[PDB]
Amino acid sequence: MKSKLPKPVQDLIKMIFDVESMKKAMVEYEIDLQKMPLGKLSKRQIQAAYSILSEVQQAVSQGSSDSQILDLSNRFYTLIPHDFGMKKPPLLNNADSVQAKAEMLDNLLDIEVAYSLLRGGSSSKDPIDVNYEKLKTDIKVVDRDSEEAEIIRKYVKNTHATTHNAYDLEVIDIFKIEREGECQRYKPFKQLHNRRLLWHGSRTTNFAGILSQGLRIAPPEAPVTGYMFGKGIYFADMVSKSANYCHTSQGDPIGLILLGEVALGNMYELKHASHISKLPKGKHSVKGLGKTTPDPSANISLDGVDVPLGTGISSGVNDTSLLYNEYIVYDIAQVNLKYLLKLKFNFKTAH
Numbered sequence: 001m002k003s004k005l006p007k008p009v010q011d012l013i014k015m016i017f018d019v020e021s022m023k024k025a026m027v028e029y030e031i032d033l034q035k036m037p038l039g040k041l042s043k044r045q046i047q048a049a050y051s052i053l054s055e056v057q058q059a060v061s062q063g064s065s066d067s068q069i070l071d072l073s074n075r076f077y078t079l080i081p082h083d084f085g086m087k088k089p090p091l092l093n094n095a096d097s098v099q100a101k102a103e104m105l106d107n108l109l110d111i112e113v114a115y116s117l118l119r120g121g122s123s124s125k126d127p128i129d130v131n132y133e134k135l136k137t138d139i140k141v142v143d144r145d146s147e148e149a150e151i152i153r154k155y156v157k158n159t160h161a162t163t164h165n166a167y168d169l170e171v172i173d174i175f176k177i178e179r180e181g182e183c184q185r186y187k188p189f190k191q192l193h194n195r196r197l198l199w200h201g202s203r204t205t206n207f208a209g210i211l212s213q214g215l216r217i218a219p220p221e222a223p224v225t226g227y228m229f230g231k232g233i234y235f236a237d238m239v240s241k242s243a244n245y246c247h248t249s250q251g252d253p254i255g256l257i258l259l260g261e262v263a264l265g266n267m268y269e270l271k272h273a274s275h276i277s278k279l280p281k282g283k284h285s286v287k288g289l290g291k292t293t294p295d296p297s298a299n300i301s302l303d304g305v306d307v308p309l310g311t312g313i314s315s316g317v318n319d320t321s322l323l324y325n326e327y328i329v330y331d332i333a334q335v336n337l338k339y340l341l342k343l344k345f346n347f348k349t350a351h
């Protein structure tokens, strides 16, 4: 039965559930699709690989022998078979190598979730309607000329800096999203002070799982050292910072970005990386202090939530490894997803 969903909603389902995009990502990661096809991927496979990366991180830091490190590296590549052609598999003997593999396993996890979702379940109704229902998310189109659309376009326009200006962002569609059960889950944290409407950028191959299971934290098996501020949910107050996580190109210039209401409370303000396991007593989030911050005078309050749509101005900071701020929560319930944007990247050089 022909779908009654708006074309921009239909086209979003087609995007996030594309199997060719999924396989394209695995190939980019240099995974052997003969030994490890899409359907062979398991949660237990990725969790076991995470455990080996933590074993590697421990081995390196506890002064293990090169043979022990190589054996561990070989175990990883046995579990997630890669195809390097003439090249040899990169030795997982340093922290950078494990951060690369942790990032990959993060992205593979959502690909497993998308494909398992897509292949699972049940006829006589459009497969787009079937797949919209699987997301357990109400996806509404926000009108181009609405007040909220004007606020979101101002947020994108003003929070787009010159350092990242190797592209221009063009907002194609704005979706008002609400995941089944997320409001009730967030209610205890709706109480907390310092709630902000922040950005979360991710690969398009990650949004089926993001809409289905929400924004998650890396599992306990994952190395805490494989993430800058530990295993939490990362956000940005400047669209350009998050837009760099959209993994777009000349070939595919369309990305997906999120606007989430994040209950931050007391922020553990830091200038340099910290591998947070447990947050300090009295703190509810981390604020990675950046050199540039949106103008605090220009802050707006859409639905009681602070929208830091201020134009990029310099902050006090001074001794920091961050150009732009970042916010991190360590409870998946501290996030309430509000909007999903479909962005066009108009790539061009600028000096």
Ligand SMILES: Oc1nc(-c2ccc(C(F)(F)F)cc2)nc2c1CSCC2
Pocket: 103, 106, 107, 199, 200, 201, 202, 203, 206, 234, 235, 236, 241, 242, 243, 245, 326, 327
């Ligand atoms: O907006 C952002 N998104 C992500 C982000 C992208 C992909 C993934 C995943 F590993 F693929 F699940 C996780 C987090 N990270 C950051 C920011 C803005 S603050 C800097 C870090």
